[PDB]
Amino acid sequence: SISMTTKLSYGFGAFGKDFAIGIVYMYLMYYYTDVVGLSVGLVGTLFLVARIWCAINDPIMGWIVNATRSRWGKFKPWILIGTLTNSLVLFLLFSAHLFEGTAQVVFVCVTYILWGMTYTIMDIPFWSLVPTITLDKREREQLVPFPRFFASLAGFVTAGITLPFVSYVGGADRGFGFQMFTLVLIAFFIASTIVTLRNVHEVYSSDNGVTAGRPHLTLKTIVGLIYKNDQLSCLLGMALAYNIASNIINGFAIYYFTYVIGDADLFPYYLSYAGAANLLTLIVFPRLVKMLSRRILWAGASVMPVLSCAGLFAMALADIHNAALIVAAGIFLNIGTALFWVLQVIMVADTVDYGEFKLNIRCESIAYSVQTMVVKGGSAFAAFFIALVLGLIGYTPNVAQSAQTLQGMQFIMIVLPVLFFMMTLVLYFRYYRLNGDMLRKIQIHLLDKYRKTPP
């Protein structure tokens, strides 16, 4: 029933959506420090505060999107505004190398936080289009792999050709090449936004006379829809734990690839094989959901990175530091993250549907606001837990540290993501219920309701 054109246009939309932020996530540290000359402490504090601010802003953006009424619906206008304003703020962000002194710092602080906010404006409604397109289990399963694959491909093409571009254009003057590549990103992002706005046509969307929308809602009642929707709360917990675990693992990988190994011959192969695994598991997700249960795929999504953690734990117990083990851990982690993200989008859709069922309110913006809130709070809480463990083990900041202290810090860093994954799976298998006959019950209920309600 889903137009192949719709799948591919939403995929290109996701490509442009993530191709504009991968550069930030991946090289804003290197820009701010190696090009602009700012203290690592300042940059880290800014990143933490901004992630907290975005997490708090997310539900406000959900309230805004839900209470919106326009010609193109309640999502497309905010999608366009977000893309445009975020492109502007991105270019301004990577133009920080011009100023100096307090003028620079202030600039850097404004742009960055604005960027965050702006992207939030763009992010929530985009994904909220998913539950308004299908409403069916298999259709969602074979829909969301397109955008997830395209997001991952954007991230990996960034990691691949973002530095060669900055080097070719400008040369020496790294800020200039950065802003030129930024313009490239702006072009792709706006093209993708136009594509998704024209082609993606929301079907079962709030705004429709039959879809049980309640636009005039308070912030109190809307944020209460999160707690009242017990399944959306389960999703909140699951995704928060999974994001904390994956952020801790990614920070460990960054630390051991940037500072420790020093063998620059490895990271290319690690990235290549990780991207291969991720894109392959995304391509083959429509298959294997029928071959293997939805629950089974969630379990595997969290278990594969647990295998990666165990492998690198064995690696740390010795000092072999085998590159084969590194690439295997990366492959497993990437398979897990792909499965997780696909199932997570499908589950946000399922949860907005279950909210319309249990309650009588349809609200996609809030569920995907929860998604983005959790995406940001994951990094926030991972940093919090790492600082907690450091203070507990007595990690003086960048001063001489015992050998066993460092090895134990590494071991506990390996361990606690396993705890978070066990938490995700406990919560899933004990409280989640949207994978079987329940899903079809919700579907038939909503479809019959729409059929009976006067349009």
Author numbering: 2 to 456
Provide excerpts from the study.
Different from the D59C mutant, the D55C mutant retains the H+-coupled melibiose active transport activity, which excludes the role of Asp55 in the H+ binding. The D55C mutation selectively eliminates the Na+ and Li+ binding and converts MelBSt to a solely H+-coupled symporter. In the D55C structure, the galactosyl moiety of bound DDMB exhibits a similar pose to that in the D59C bound with either DDMB or α-NPG. The densities of the 11-carbon tail were disordered and only 2 carbons were modeled. The glucosyl moiety pose is different from that in the D59C structure. The Na+-binding pocket in both crystal structures is nearly identical to the previously published D59C structures, with a Cys present at positions of either Asp55 or Asp59, respectively. In comparison with the Na+-bound WT MelBSt cryoEM structure, both the DDMB-bound D55C and apo D59C MelBSt mutants exhibited loosely packed side chains in this cation-binding pocket due to the absence of Na+ (the D55C structure was removed for clarity). The data support that the D55C mutant retains the H+-coupled symport activity mediated by the protonation and deprotonation of the Asp59 residue.
The melibiose permease of Salmonella enterica serovar Typhimurium (MelBSt), a member of MFS transporters, catalyzes the symport of a galactopyranoside with either of H+, Li+, or Na+, which makes MelB as a unique system for studying cation-coupled transport mechanisms. The Na+ binding involves two negatively charged residues, Asp55 and Asp59 (helix II), and two polar residues, Asn58 (helix II) and Thr121 (helix IV).
